[PDB]
Here is the input.
Amino acid sequence: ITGTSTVGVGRGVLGDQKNINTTYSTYYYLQDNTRGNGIFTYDAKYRTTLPGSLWADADNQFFASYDAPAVDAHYYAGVTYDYYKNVHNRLSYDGNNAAIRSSVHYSQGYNNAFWNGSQMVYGDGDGQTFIPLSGGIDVVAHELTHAVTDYTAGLIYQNESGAINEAISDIFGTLVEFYANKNPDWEIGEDVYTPGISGDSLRSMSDPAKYGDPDHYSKRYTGTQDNGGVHINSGIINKAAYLISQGGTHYGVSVVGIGRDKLGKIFYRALTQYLTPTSNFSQLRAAAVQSATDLYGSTSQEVASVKQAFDAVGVK
Ligand SMILES: [Ca+2]
Ligand SMILES: [Ca+2]
Ligand SMILES: [Ca+2]
Ligand SMILES: [Ca+2]
Ligand SMILES: [Zn+2]
Here is the structure.
């Protein structure tokens, strides 16, 4: 909407206070004009018709319980935009500052979040498996990264290409979580998953097997559930990414870590310059090796560590 840029204040899902960029025109809207062609947050009002209505508020204060998922979807979309722009010189998900749209309060008891081809969508959870999912910065960045993937490599959402797609979203979700630097970890969704259980998460990148996901290609899922295991086999690539960054010895294979920033550079370049819609795990390894070669040189530690990490997870 046309209006003037304003700054509201509110509380997110976890009770933390934050400022949010809004727009004033009769109401204060969750419309951040400071980033690209805007970040827009919508109320789906417990229904499944999207996007719903652009979030309107009478006083620019967002402290009601109903406001909390909107505050966090809006704010964390901004952090994710800043990560891609400042770290990778990428302007929004399409590279051309496309408007970023999110809807919260999607459906009833909805234990998921997704990119629908055009926008992000967040359930509130059922209060048992999840609380409102936009409370996780890694979740928000995971969702926006699906849009980045779709505009770039275009990885088809099934089997190995789909597990790469998933891992890319978990990798960049985690790197955004580290960028914001509030309780960062290599776990996925811990801030919104299972409020009655402390210390767990939806997935682990450092130890995928803790939540039943494979950490080696010889343990990959080969069935048809979950689009051929896209949220399961992502553990193999997540583990490789974790090893590239942090190092370790895994199934007897030692990996020298090179740190998160170089991980992000290597995987961003692989995603945007080398991967294709049908890339498989072996082709991701080749893309990562080539990306590290471009960035750091064929004889570099970075290239050697990429190879060690993929060896450690059984991907040749
Ligand atoms: Ca208000
Ligand atoms: Ca965390
Ligand atoms: Ca996390
Ligand atoms: Ca929990
Ligand atoms: Zn996903």
About this structure: Helices lie at 68-88, 137-151, 159-180, 225-229, 234-246, 260-274, 281-296, 301-312.
